[PDB]
Structure 1
Amino acid sequence: MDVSILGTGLMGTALAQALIRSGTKVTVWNRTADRALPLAAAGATVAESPQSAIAASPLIVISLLNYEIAKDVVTEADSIAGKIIVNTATGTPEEANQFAEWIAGRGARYLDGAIAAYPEDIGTESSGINYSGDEDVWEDVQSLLTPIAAQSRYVGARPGAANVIDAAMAGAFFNVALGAFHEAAAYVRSEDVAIAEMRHSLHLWTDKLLELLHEALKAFESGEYETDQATLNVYAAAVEAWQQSMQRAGQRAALMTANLDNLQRACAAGHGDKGIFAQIETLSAN
C-alpha cells in the first residue's frame, strides 16, 4: 500500500523521508510547491495538484498548517471516496470532530493524528505520534505508519482525543513546565547566584518529575490519595515560603502564585491531610 502526503513543510518532508526508507511508494504535494523539489531527489513522485495526489494512493497523510487549510485542500478532489485520510494537524477536539464527520460524508475513512516530535526526531527513538478515531482504520494502517515513529498509539475512538492529549501534554504540562524553569532561573539570578550551577541537577529533577508523573497518574486512576508522607498542608506551606522568598527577591512569581492558589483551594476544601495528588479535586472552575 502506497501513500500521498499533502504538505512538505519540514514535518511532511520528514514524514515522507521516513516512509520511503520504510519501503513504501510515496507521492508528495505542496502549495508552496518548490519546497517539495528535494523530495523528488530522495525518491518521491511530486504532483501537479491535490487531486492527482489524492488519486495516486489509497492512504493520504495530510500535513498542512491548520484544519482550515486541509479542508480547503481536499475540497479540491471531487472524489475522496474509499480513501483513508490521516490528518496530523494540531487543533481543538471540535475541529477534529467536524473534520472527521466531513471526511466520513465523502465516503472516506478518517484517523486524527497528533505529533509529539521535532521534524528531525521522526526517524529516531525520540519520536511519538498519537492517533484517534475509527479503530478499524488504525488497524489497517498500523504496519504502514508505526515505522516512522518510535512510539505510535491509538488513544481512543473520539476523533478529538489525540488533540486533547496533545493540548494537555504540550500546553498544560510541557509549556507551563518550561515557564516554571524561567521563573526558577530568574530567581537564581536575582539572588546573585550563578545560573550555571543549576545545570548538573537538571536530569535528576526531570528524572524525578517523570516518576512522580507516573505516580500522579496512578492516583488519578485510583481514588487513593492515601497520605503516606508529605501532605497538602506541608506543600502549601513550603510553596508560600518559596513564593515569598521569590517575591522578596523581586520576582512576580506568577506561576508559583498560581501553584500556591491551586494548593490552598485543595486544603480549604479539606484535602490538607491527603497526598499532593489530591490537588486535582479543586481545578474545576466550579
Structure 2
Amino acid sequence: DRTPVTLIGLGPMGQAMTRALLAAGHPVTVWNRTPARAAGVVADGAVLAASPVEAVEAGDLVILSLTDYQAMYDVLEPATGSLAGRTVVNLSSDTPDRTRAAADWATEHGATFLTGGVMIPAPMVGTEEAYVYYSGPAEVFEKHRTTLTVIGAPRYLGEDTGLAQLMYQAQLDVFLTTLSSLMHATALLGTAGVSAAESMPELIGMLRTVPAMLEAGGENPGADIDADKHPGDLSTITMMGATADHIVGASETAGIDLALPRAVQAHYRRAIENGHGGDNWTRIIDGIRSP
C-alpha cells in the first residue's frame, strides 16, 4: 500500500510516525506550525507543505499528532474547504466529548473521522510492541487499517468516536498517576538521604511484580468488581487504609506533597465510613464512582 499520507504535528510522535510510514513506502506530506522542526523528516523523504491547505490536499488520509484538539482547529481552520472526501485520523489527547464534537465538525466539512490513542512512546512506534486504540465508523477504519498498522497494532473498540479517547484517558489515568507516585516515593526516600538511583530500581522492581501480586491466591479483580465480590480474606480495606494513613503521616513528616496520598487515603476512609472496612481493596471503586 503506497497510499499518500498527510501528517500534521511534528513532535516526537509525529516524527516517529512519519518515519515509519516513509519506511513502509508511503509518500508522506507533512505540515508543522514550526516549519524548521520538519527538517529531520524532510531529509528522510517527507515533503514539507507550505500551507495546511496544501498538506490536506496531498492525501486522502490526514493524521494529526498534536498536543490537544484545540490545535486541530487552529491548524485545520484555514483548510476547512479542502477536507471533503478525506479521512481525518486524530491521534491526539483530549476529553471524550471534545472528540465526539470534533467528529461531527469533520462530518459537516465533508470528511470522515477516526479517533486513535497511541499507547507507546516515540522510540517504540512501528515496532512489535506498538499498539493503538481506534474508535469511529467501522468502514472508515477498514479502509485505512493497513496504513494505520504501520504505526502499531490497531485495537478497534467500536463506533463511538469518544471511546478510543476514553480508553486513552483511562490508560493515562493509570500511567500518569503511577508516575506521580514513583516521583512521590522517590521524594520520600530522598528525605532520609536515599538517592533516586538507589530508590527508583527498588520501586520499579516492585511495580514489575504488581500483575502477579494481584493474581496471587486466585483473586481476579475485574470479574470480582463486576460480580460485586469484594471478600477481605487476604487483605482488607482496614489494613490497607491504615497503611494509607501511615503514608500520609510519613509524607507530612517528610515535608512533601500531601494531595496525592490524601486522595488515596480518602478512598479507604470512604469505604470504611460506608461500612466495608472488612472488604477487599477493590471496594474503593464504589466511593470513586459516587463522590
> Deviations along 1:68-117, whole A, 9 cap, x unmatched?
23224333331322211101121111211111001112221110122233
> Deviations along 1:17-46, whole A, 9 cap, x unmatched?
011112222222223223223323312233
- How many residue pairs get matched? 284
- The answer for the alignment partner of 1:64 in structure 2 is 66
**SS of corresponding position for 2:149:** helix
Q: Structure 1 CA distance, aligned partners of 2:94 and 2:200?
A: 34
- The answer for the alignment partner of 2:277 in structure 1 is 272
- The answer for the alignment partner of 2:87 in structure 1 is 84
Q: Structure 2 CA distance, aligned partners of 1:63 and 1:190?
A: 39
**SS of corresponding position for 1:155:** strand
* Greater mean deviation of Cα atoms: 238-247 or 107-116: 238-247
* Greater mean deviation of Cα atoms: 107-116 or 216-225: 216-225
Could you list the runs of 5+ residues in structure 1 that have no partner in the other structure? none
> Deviations along 1:45-66, whole A, 9 cap, x unmatched?
3323222222222111122343
Q: Which amino acid in structure 1 is aligned with residue 164 of structure 2?
A: A
* Greater mean deviation of Cα atoms: 9-18 or 118-127: 118-127
- The answer for the alignment partner of 1:110 in structure 2 is 113
- The answer for the alignment partner of 1:160 in structure 2 is 162
Measured on the aligned residues, the alpha-carbon RMSD in Å equals: 2.5
- The answer for the alignment partner of 2:238 in structure 1 is 233
Q: Structure 2 CA distance, aligned partners of 1:8 and 1:98?
A: 24
**SS of corresponding position for 2:289:** coil
Q: Structure 2 CA distance, aligned partners of 1:250 and 1:43?
A: 52
Are positions 1:183 and 2:184 aligned together? yes
Q: Using a 3 Å threshold, how does the CA distance of structure 1 residues 67 and 238 change in structure 2: closer, same or farther?
A: closer
Q: Structure 2 CA distance, aligned partners of 1:84 and 1:144?
A: 12
Correspondence list, 1:1-286, <5 A: 1-77=3-79, 78-149=81-152, 151-170=153-172, 172-193=173-194, 196-211=197-212, 215-251=220-256, 253-286=258-291
Q: Structure 2 CA distance, aligned partners of 1:246 and 1:34?
A: 45
Scaled by the length of structure 2, the TM-score of the pair is 0.85
Q: Tell me if structure 2 keeps the 8 A contact 1:22–1:148.
A: no
Scaled by the length of structure 1, the TM-score of the pair is 0.87
Q: Structure 1 CA distance, aligned partners of 2:43 and 2:201?
A: 43
Q: Using a 3 Å threshold, how does the CA distance of structure 1 residues 9 and 198 change in structure 2: closer, same or farther?
A: closer
Q: Structure 1 CA distance, aligned partners of 2:186 and 2:39?
A: 44
Could you list the runs of 5+ residues in structure 2 that have no partner in the other structure? none
**SS of corresponding position for 1:267:** helix
Q: Structure 1 CA distance, aligned partners of 2:161 and 2:214?
A: 25
Q: Using a 3 Å threshold, how does the CA distance of structure 1 residues 268 and 6 change in structure 2: closer, same or farther?
A: same
Task: Please state how far the C-alpha of 1:266 moved relative to its aligned partner.
Answer: 0.8
Q: Using a 3 Å threshold, how does the CA distance of structure 1 residues 194 and 103 change in structure 2: closer, same or farther?
A: closer
Task: Please state how far the C-alpha of 1:233 moved relative to its aligned partner.
Answer: 1.6
Q: Structure 2 CA distance, aligned partners of 1:98 and 1:85?
A: 13
Q: Which amino acid in structure 1 is aligned with residue 276 of structure 2?
A: H
